[PDB]
């Protein structure tokens, strides 16, 4: 079943392309489609209510990791659901594109790894208990 690393790279590659960037510039590294589409819908819902994530973030190379973990820990503090996992991908995507915009491209491959490891260590058990990524595809369509 699904390599989380692969998922992260696919999602981030997509979100970077939406900002005119190529994944290969910064990195030498049905589920994928559902996640891309869900990310687009999530971001539409987000900007209907709030400001684009890329506008809200305050990034520095020295605090990027700490910033990433604080956001993700609060996002999942009182539980996990598929919508929050989509939020997690969208946040990582926003963090990457903003990193590039702010001339901190070094962070792109790091953020992808932070995401992959958080998925593998902290979200994967829940994903398994909820039927795997196939469940997400069937729910989203």
């Amino acid at each position: 079943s699904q390599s989380n690393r692969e998922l992260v790279v696919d999602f981030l590659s997509y979100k970077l392309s939406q900002k005119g960037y190529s994944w290969s510039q910064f990195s030498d590294v049905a589920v994928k489609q559902a996640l891309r589409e869900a990310g687009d819908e999530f971001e539409l819902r987000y900007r209907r209510a709030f400001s684009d994530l890329t506008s809200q973030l305050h990034i520095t190379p020295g605090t990027a990791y700490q910033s990433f973990e604080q956001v993700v820990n609060e996002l999942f503090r009182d539980g996990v659901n598929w919508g929050r996992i989509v939020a997690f991908f969208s946040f990582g995507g926003a963090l990457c594109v903003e990193s590039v915009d702010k001339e901190m491209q070094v962070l792109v491959s790091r953020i992808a790894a932070w995401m992959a490891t958080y998925l593998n260590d902290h979200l994967e058990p829940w994903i398994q208990e909820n039927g795997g990524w196939d469940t997400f595809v069937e729910l989203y369509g």
Partner: peptide, 21 residues
Amino acid sequence: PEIWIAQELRRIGDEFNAYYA
């Protein structure tokens, strides 16, 4: 703003989740 961002992500996440539940 980390906590603020996470709270907004969570709210839209839960809205998203409820729609496709």
